[PDB]
Design a protein around this motif. Structure first.
Motif, PDB file in Angstrom:
ATOM      1  N   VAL B 100     -68.110  16.264 -40.517  1.00  0.00           N
ATOM      2  CA  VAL B 100     -67.322  17.152 -41.361  1.00  0.00           C
ATOM      3  C   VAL B 100     -66.336  16.315 -42.162  1.00  0.00           C
ATOM      4  CG1 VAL B 100     -67.582  19.261 -40.040  1.00  0.00           C
ATOM      5  CG2 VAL B 100     -65.838  17.624 -39.394  1.00  0.00           C
ATOM      6  N   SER B 104     -61.297  18.504 -44.897  1.00  0.00           N
ATOM      7  CA  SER B 104     -61.351  19.828 -44.288  1.00  0.00           C
ATOM      8  C   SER B 104     -60.586  19.862 -42.975  1.00  0.00           C
ATOM      9  CB  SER B 104     -62.795  20.242 -44.049  1.00  0.00           C
ATOM     10  OG  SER B 104     -63.260  19.703 -42.829  1.00  0.00           O
ATOM     11  N   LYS B 112     -57.169  29.916 -35.374  1.00  0.00           N
ATOM     12  CA  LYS B 112     -58.054  30.746 -36.181  1.00  0.00           C
ATOM     13  C   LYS B 112     -58.668  29.966 -37.334  1.00  0.00           C
ATOM     14  CE  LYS B 112     -55.736  34.090 -37.827  1.00  0.00           C
ATOM     15  NZ  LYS B 112     -54.573  34.979 -38.080  1.00  0.00           N
ATOM     16  N   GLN B 113     -58.106  28.805 -37.676  1.00  0.00           N
ATOM     17  CA  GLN B 113     -58.740  27.931 -38.654  1.00  0.00           C
ATOM     18  C   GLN B 113     -59.813  27.068 -38.008  1.00  0.00           C
ATOM     19  OE1 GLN B 113     -55.710  26.052 -41.120  1.00  0.00           O
ATOM     20  NE2 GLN B 113     -54.900  28.120 -41.392  1.00  0.00           N
ATOM     21  N   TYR B 116     -62.741  29.294 -37.381  1.00  0.00           N
ATOM     22  CA  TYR B 116     -63.476  29.475 -38.628  1.00  0.00           C
ATOM     23  C   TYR B 116     -64.263  28.217 -38.973  1.00  0.00           C
ATOM     24  CZ  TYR B 116     -64.304  29.926 -43.657  1.00  0.00           C
ATOM     25  OH  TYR B 116     -64.865  29.924 -44.910  1.00  0.00           O
ATOM     26  N   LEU B 117     -63.690  27.044 -38.701  1.00  0.00           N
ATOM     27  CA  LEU B 117     -64.441  25.803 -38.859  1.00  0.00           C
ATOM     28  C   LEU B 117     -65.727  25.818 -38.046  1.00  0.00           C
ATOM     29  CD1 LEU B 117     -64.387  23.136 -40.227  1.00  0.00           C
ATOM     30  CD2 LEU B 117     -63.463  22.108 -38.200  1.00  0.00           C
ATOM     31  N   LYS B 119     -67.449  28.148 -36.938  1.00  0.00           N
ATOM     32  CA  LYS B 119     -68.420  29.124 -37.414  1.00  0.00           C
ATOM     33  C   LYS B 119     -69.108  28.663 -38.691  1.00  0.00           C
ATOM     34  CE  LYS B 119     -66.413  33.414 -35.797  1.00  0.00           C
ATOM     35  NZ  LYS B 119     -65.059  33.993 -35.606  1.00  0.00           N
ATOM     36  N   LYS B 120     -68.384  27.966 -39.569  1.00  0.00           N
ATOM     37  CA  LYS B 120     -68.939  27.606 -40.869  1.00  0.00           C
ATOM     38  C   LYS B 120     -70.112  26.645 -40.736  1.00  0.00           C
ATOM     39  CE  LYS B 120     -68.131  28.675 -45.206  1.00  0.00           C
ATOM     40  NZ  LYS B 120     -69.323  29.058 -46.006  1.00  0.00           N
ATOM     41  N   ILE B 121     -70.016  25.678 -39.827  1.00  0.00           N
ATOM     42  CA  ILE B 121     -71.061  24.671 -39.675  1.00  0.00           C
ATOM     43  C   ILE B 121     -72.067  25.150 -38.640  1.00  0.00           C
ATOM     44  CG2 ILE B 121     -69.602  22.757 -40.403  1.00  0.00           C
ATOM     45  CD1 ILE B 121     -68.894  22.165 -37.657  1.00  0.00           C
ATOM     46  N   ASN B 122     -72.002  26.438 -38.307  1.00  0.00           N
ATOM     47  CA  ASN B 122     -72.916  27.071 -37.357  1.00  0.00           C
ATOM     48  C   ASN B 122     -72.847  26.432 -35.974  1.00  0.00           C
ATOM     49  OD1 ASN B 122     -74.682  29.139 -36.768  1.00  0.00           O
ATOM     50  ND2 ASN B 122     -76.075  28.644 -38.458  1.00  0.00           N
ATOM     51  N   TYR B 124     -70.754  27.710 -33.681  1.00  0.00           N
ATOM     52  CA  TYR B 124     -70.190  28.749 -32.833  1.00  0.00           C
ATOM     53  C   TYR B 124     -71.235  29.493 -32.017  1.00  0.00           C
ATOM     54  CZ  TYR B 124     -66.415  31.942 -31.539  1.00  0.00           C
ATOM     55  OH  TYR B 124     -65.465  32.660 -30.855  1.00  0.00           O
TER      56      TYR B 124
END
Lengths: 267, 216, 89, 204, 148
Positions: B100, B104, B112-113, B116-117, B119-122, B124
């Motif tokens: 990453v 970023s 919560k950031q 979200y990180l 989750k974005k790169i899948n 999670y």
RNA sequence: AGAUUUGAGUAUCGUAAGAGGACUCCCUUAACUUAAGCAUAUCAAUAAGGGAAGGAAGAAAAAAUAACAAUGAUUUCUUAAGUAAUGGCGAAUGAAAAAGAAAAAGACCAAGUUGAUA
RNA sequence: UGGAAGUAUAAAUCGAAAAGGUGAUAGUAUUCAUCAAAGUCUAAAUAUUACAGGAAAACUGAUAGCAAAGAAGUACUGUGAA
RNA sequence: AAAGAAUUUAAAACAUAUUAGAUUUAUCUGAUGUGUGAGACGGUGAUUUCUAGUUAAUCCUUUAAUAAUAAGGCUU
């Protein structure tokens, strides 16, 4: 294998487990951290000499002793009473061992004294040392002008030949002996002229107001030994015929022959 | 305790009394006077060789072999077949040596950031496995404090300049971080399995050539 | 070039450097000695050692100073002191 | 000065003058009680060398001790020991006569501190010393920066713990070097340190 | 690893691998090296014949720092400076620069002669020299210095 | 009568006593055990007995090492090392300088001198 | 005591100095090296299973773990130490 | 008889001759020059090997160097 185990005595009461070792490292590290905070030259680990090691097994490796002898502090032009208070150890017990040890340490003090920067004994700008500095600027400026003048007329020759040999070595590593032979003759004359000379008993403490740049120790800014690279020499005809073994068997046999001389002359 | 079991003053009664020869307590007038004593087989006697505190708890290892095992746990985290077989859900990740951008990471300050990180790169799909499969321990572990026995999740190997992002990832269940220098077999290979899901960062990924060197 | 590692002349060539201070007494010690010598006299072993020296038995005075002091170099230093008082009378 | 003649005089203990002077004192102290304070020291050159100064708080105590060895304290000379430890006579104490007499004065006068002690005389049966005691709580001792170190707590019963000059020798603290390897920093504190089996944390 | 020992496989055996006719009694011939000349003489004779006796004089206070003298054979002299430096000066001769293999800096005092040196002139500087070491260095066309 | 010295009583102001001893400094001449017996030796500064203190205590500024390209108070740790030595030379007991680190701080009495002496 | 023709302590006898000690094979002699005993103090690095306040644990979980998870050094025995 | 520059600039012991202050005894205390102890030149030479003459020592150790007594080593 025949066993040699000293457990016949009581040992379960003579054990010493090292469980406090992880916490000893923390306890000491939180002392230096809380000691440099109080006054930083407290942990500065006051400067130590550069002495050789005892015994012929380590007689080529340098290491830090403790305290500069009374002869070094006078040669480096330092007061013995003041030196203890400016992060320089003193060892009046130690006796000077060689004229090479006297020069090697005297340079160690001189280099450190030029790095040293002492703050005034009283913080206020009206301190007498700060006052006396502005009262003697006129005399100091004249002294620096005459020192600078006669430091350049005397080295007017050592500069050029040392320039020549340094420059001539560049060609040979891309004649030389001529530059080296000339330099040797100049340094001999300089040494004779000095002998053929009283000076300051003491130098001046560098006292100034500056930024507080704090360094935990002083022995790590003046290296003990200069780095050593490969040493190369000119292979002449004289060194090709040096009977090294015959010299060792001659010096040893002379030592064993001091018994015969005494026995012979006693009869 | 050194003096546990051996605090009595019992001397064996001996033969001729129709009782065994194990030491028996002296005195009288108590239910204990006359009973068994120090022997390992008796009751309230010292056990078999009592455990002494000066045993060998910690173990040693050569350095050049301790670093050999790290380079073989990092190397097996780039093989999706090994990583999937270890219990990691790397079905949807783009690249298994996942990186990453360090920019970023530098904006991450709240959990919560960081969530979200992930989750974005899948990444999670794996952290939710830790959340959805947290259960209690079995046996005497709960008597001593260890109650919850989670699973393992992605490892965020950050770098020198990603230090302020540690406090974000440090509360997500099953997301353990470790600096690139402090990598060890206890991190990259937990439970002796190999192929831990590593989520690098740009600062750490570009340092692995300086830290570990190459084959020449 | 760099000396040899054997023999009487052995070692790296350097310029070694110490005073051999003599731990002696002052001139007034010749007065403090006679002041106390006059008041005290001689021991029970110094007086008999004086008898041997008067009769010329110089060696037996040494073997009697050694027996009562236990050191050869402290027997000569005491025999001379005793015989230096015989010539002072 | 007047004290570099006394010091040189006191070294002639076999002189007829001293042998008569010590004969009277050894008679006087035989009949007086065992430990009793004397007003002023009788060897003031030696008294003032060991620390005594004629100021308030300093006192001088005289202790008479019966010299000569003694039998091993076992009834009727009966010891249930192997022939190696079956002797009775010819067993010499480690602590000297000076330390033994010093410990008696400290116990009798427990409120003071023993500073040092010296030798006075002897006869065929006894040996008489003189102990220089210091009263720590006296205001003159406390307010003198060069002597208030004796008011510290750890100096309580200085001589029963082996701290004075006389009792330190019996511990072997005379000189330095490789002749005193076993008594480098204490006879028993050195022994425990050598016999320790150091078990590191990451040991082979 | 106490599940790998022999006790975990010898459960159910009464004697526990130590025999019935001769049990596992405490002592089997003393404690330690007992019986060195009486009943274990067949051990200190078969496996340590010179164990019992006296040989050699007594050094009351041996000074092990005066027997210390590490040695390097001639074949290993060139490996102190390297194989790149050896090849660099492989065509040198008398009059031009050659490397000085200061052995004392690296911790080798004596220089012994074993094996063969490469055919290049070389300067060797060390405290002690062997008789056949000096010939090997000189026959190649080198020099033998002394230090300290 | 007076000037001293020494020894007491009484009064005032203070002091030691006892508890604790895990760690610290010591006095003492134990044995079971090992030596395949046993008597020197090992167990062993070990058990018991006895004395004294602190938050730490003990040591501390060379009548010290060394034979050097010389070091430099004390303590503690790594290494020297199961080595030199000791021992019915049997069983067994067994250090130190050198070298690497933590910490580093040096000062006083007596003697000597100044005495319209304090 | 490792210290071996004596490393340390002590006792009996003896007992110095116009100084001297050490250089561990006793002795004498001549050199050489290094220190200068017979008084005292001195924080920091160090130790700990008394005790008190805490934190931990691949430790035991009521025949286990202290002897004691309850009014446990309690009930009970002995004249007594125990 | 033959081959052989030898490495480079901060100094203390005081063995010496001279003075100044004192002492009387087994006499000291200061200070100024000197060399000692000195090292920076193919040809000279420090130095080492070889050939014979002469003298001296000669199995090893007592660990700063020698000596004669003593003691310890190796072989039988």
């Amino acid at each position: 294998a025949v066993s040699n185990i000293h457990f016949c005595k009581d040992w379960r009461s003579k054990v010493h487990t090292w469980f406090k070792q992880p916490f000893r490292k923390i306890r000491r590290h939180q002392t230096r951290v809380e000691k440099a905070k109080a006054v930083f030259p407290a942990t500065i680990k006051s400067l130590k000499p550069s002495v050789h090691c005892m015994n012929q097994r380590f007689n080529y490796k340098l290491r830090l002793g403790r305290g500069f002898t009374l002869k070094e502090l006078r040669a480096a032009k330092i007061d013995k009473n003041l030196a203890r208070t400016i992060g320089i150890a003193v060892d009046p017990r130690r006796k000077e061992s060689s004229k090479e040890c006297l020069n090697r340490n005297a340079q160690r003090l001189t280099e450190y004294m030029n790095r040293l920067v002492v703050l005034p004994k009283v913080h206020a700008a009206t301190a007498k040392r700060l006052v006396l500095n502005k009262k003697n600027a006129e005399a100091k400026t004249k002294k620096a002008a005459e020192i600078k003048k006669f430091i350049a007329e005397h080295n007017k020759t050592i500069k050029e030949l040392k320039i020549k040999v340094a420059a001539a070595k560049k060609d040979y590593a891309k004649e030389l002996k001529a530059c080296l032979k000339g330099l040797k003759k100049a340094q001999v004359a300089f040494a004779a002229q000095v002998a053929k000379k009283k000076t300051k008993q003491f130098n001046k403490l560098p006292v100034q107001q500056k930024e507080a740049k704090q360094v935990l120790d002083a022995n790590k800014v003046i290296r003990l030994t200069a780095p050593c690279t490969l040493e190369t020499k000119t292979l002449t005809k004289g060194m090709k015929a040096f009977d090294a073994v015959a010299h060792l068997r001659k010096a040893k046999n002379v030592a064993k022959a001091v018994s015969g001389i005494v026995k012979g002359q006693k009869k | 305790s050194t003096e546990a079991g051996k605090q009595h003053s019992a001397i064996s009664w001996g033969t001729g009394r129709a009782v065994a020869r194990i030491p028996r307590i002296s005195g009288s007038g108590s239910g204990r006077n006359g009973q068994g004593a120090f022997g390992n087989m008796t009751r309230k006697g010292h056990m078999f060789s009592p455990l002494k505190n000066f045993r060998k708890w910690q173990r040693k290892t050569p350095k050049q072999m301790r670093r050999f095992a790290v380079a073989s746990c990092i190397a097996a985290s780039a093989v999706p077949a090994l990583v999937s077989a270890r219990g990691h859900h790397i079905a949807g990740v783009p690249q298994i040596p996942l990186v990453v951008n360090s920019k970023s990471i530098s904006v991450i300050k709240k959990t919560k950031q960081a969530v979200y990180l992930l989750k974005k790169i899948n990444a999670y799909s794996d952290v939710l496995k830790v959340i959805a499969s947290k259960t209690v321990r079995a046996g005497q572990g709960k008597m001593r404090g260890r109650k919850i026995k989670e699973r393992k999740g992605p490892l965020v190997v950050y770098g020198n300049d990603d230090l302020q992002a540690v406090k974000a990832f440090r509360n997500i269940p099953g997301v353990d971080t470790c600096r690139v220098e402090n990598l060890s077999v206890l991190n990259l290979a937990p439970g002796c399995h190999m192929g831990r899901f590593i989520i690098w960062t740009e600062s750490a990924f570009k340092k692995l050539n300086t830290i570990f060197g190459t084959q020449k | 070039m760099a000396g040899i590692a054997v023999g009487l002349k052995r070692g790296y060539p350097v310029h070694t450097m110490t005073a051999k201070r003599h731990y002696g007494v002052t001139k007034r010690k010749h007065v403090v000695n006679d002041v106390i010598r006059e008041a005290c006299g001689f021991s029970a072993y110094e007086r008999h050692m004086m008898d041997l020296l008067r009769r010329g038995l110089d060696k037996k005075a040494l073997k009697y100073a050694k027996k009562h002091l236990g050191t050869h170099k402290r027997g000569l230093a005491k025999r001379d002191e005793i015989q230096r008082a015989l010539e002072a009378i | 000065g007047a004290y570099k003649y006394i010091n040189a005089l006191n070294r002639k203990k076999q002189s007829d003058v001293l042998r008569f002077l010590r004969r009277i004192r050894c008679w006087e102290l035989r009949h007086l009680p065992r430990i009793h304070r004397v007003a002023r020291p009788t060897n003031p050159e030696r008294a003032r060398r060991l620390g005594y100064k004629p100021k308030s708080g300093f006192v001088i105590y005289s202790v008479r001790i019966h010299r000569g060895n003694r039998k091993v304290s076992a009834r009727k000379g009966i010891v249930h020991r192997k022939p190696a430890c079956q002797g009775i006579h010819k067993i010499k104490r480690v602590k000297s006569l000076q330390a033994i007499a010093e410990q008696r004065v400290g116990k009798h006068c427990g409120a003071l501190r023993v500073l040092n002690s010296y030798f006075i005389g002897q006869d065929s049966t006894y040996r008489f010393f003189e102990v220089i005691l210091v009263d720590p709580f006296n205001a003159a001792i406390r307010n003198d920066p060069k002597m208030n170190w004796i008011c510290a707590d750890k100096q309580k019963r200085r001589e029963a713990r082996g701290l004075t000059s006389a009792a330190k020798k019996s511990r072997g603290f005379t000189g330095k070097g490789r002749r005193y390897n076993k008594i480098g920093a204490g006879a028993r504190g050195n022994l425990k340190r050598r016999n320790l089996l150091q078990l590191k944390r990451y040991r082979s | 690893a106490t599940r790998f020992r022999q006790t975990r496989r010898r459960r159910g055996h009464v004697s526990m691998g130590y025999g019935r006719i001769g049990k596992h009694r405490k002592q089997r011939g003393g404690r330690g090296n007992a019986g060195g000349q009486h009943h274990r003489k067949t051990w200190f004779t078969t496996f340590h014949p010179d164990y019992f006796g006296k040989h050699g004089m007594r050094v009351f206070h041996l000074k092990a720092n005066k027997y210390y003298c590490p040695s390097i054979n001639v074949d290993s002299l060139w490996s102190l400076v390297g194989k790149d430096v050896q090849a660099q000066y492989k065509n040198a001769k008398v009059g031009e620069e050659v490397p000085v293999i200061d052995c004392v800096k690296h911790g080798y005092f004596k220089v012994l002669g074993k094996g063969f040196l490469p055919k290049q002139p070389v300067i060797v500087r060390a405290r002690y020299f062997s008789e056949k070491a000096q010939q090997k260095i000189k026959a190649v066309g080198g020099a033998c210095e002394l230090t300290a």
